[PDB]
Design a protein around this nucleic acid. Sequence first.
DNA 1: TCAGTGAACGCTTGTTGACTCGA
DNA 2: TCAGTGAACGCTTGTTGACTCGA
Lengths: 194, 194
Amino acid sequence: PRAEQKQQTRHALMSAARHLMESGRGFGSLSLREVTRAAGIVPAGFYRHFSDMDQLGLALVAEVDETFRATLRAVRRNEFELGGLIDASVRIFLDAVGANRSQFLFLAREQYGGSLPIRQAIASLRQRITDDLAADLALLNKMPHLDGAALDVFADLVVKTVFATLPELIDHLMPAAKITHQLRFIMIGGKHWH
Amino acid sequence: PRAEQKQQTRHALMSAARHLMESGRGFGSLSLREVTRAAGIVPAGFYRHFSDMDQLGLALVAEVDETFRATLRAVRRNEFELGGLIDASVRIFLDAVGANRSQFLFLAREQYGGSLPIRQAIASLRQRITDDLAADLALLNKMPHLDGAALDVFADLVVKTVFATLPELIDHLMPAAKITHQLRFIMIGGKHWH
DNA sequence: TCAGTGAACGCTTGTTGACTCGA
DNA sequence: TCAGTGAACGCTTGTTGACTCGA
């Protein structure tokens, strides 16, 4: 219809919330009045879209989720080529973060700091990425010395590092080279296990 | 004097703030009125102690700092014994977290989520722990295949993991065994570099 | 039909000030 | 002398309701 305009106001409330966080503030400290004010609606209009600041947080987890998975697919595709595996995928990864900074900022900030419900949603997102990585290593036989249980712990290490790196990726020892160096240490670890 | 009582009210404002966070809330969303209410003073009494909720955050960074360094010293002492290095130090570490849960909770939550000034303070605390670890590995020749630059990146990986693990340490694949397994992967990585 | 409005609700907020009254 | 008080300041908050007016 022109309920294409409704969604446009939906995006506005979402984008305003993310961008309001860009100065150092947490999502939990944001008022509904200040988000509607930044998005361009009267306070009460917020409810034609969300009942809760919490419900907006959840839509913010779901939004990063689409973006983050479109990125993992591009890395997955790239893993089938012989050699250079790490450097290429870091690049694809950093490109995508660069292209989508405020979403990843939301993730980096709220991953442990928000209201429990939003922390639950982030936990689910992170278990799926970890599972998907455990499946992919299992599939390609990249760590032959690791059984199912050891892969789940390894995969969890890899996802823990990437997630712990996000904040320094947002705003020699340059991000790219460091993270790549750091992931190398972990891969080597995985190969020489026994 | 009995300005031993003043400090007691200082501890109360600090403890209340930390404990108010224990339900999922961020430090940034806490009002001064609710902290004084929980500590047992009239709102205005807060200023005989702090001018700012921010200044209280900074006293909360400094408090975790003493506790966290008393712990690192006990791990340092333990590193001079031949064998078992990892399992013992994890235990000492988890004991100390257990004994001081709400402080470490503060750290885990605010490490990327607070106001920039508190994020600065946490950054300084984390650089010092990372430097101290780089110095200690340098001292004992634990990673002979790594020059100064490589140690700073390794040390940063180790501190990144410990910090990224804190939240699951607060409230088979048990924390202790996982973290130990995960650190092993990293150590092995460090040894087989070249 | 319904996305966005404007007014009005009871309430909590950070900071002021001149105070009390025990160490 | 000064840690803690109690009242009062101008202001922002989440949610209500009956409304307007273009698609």
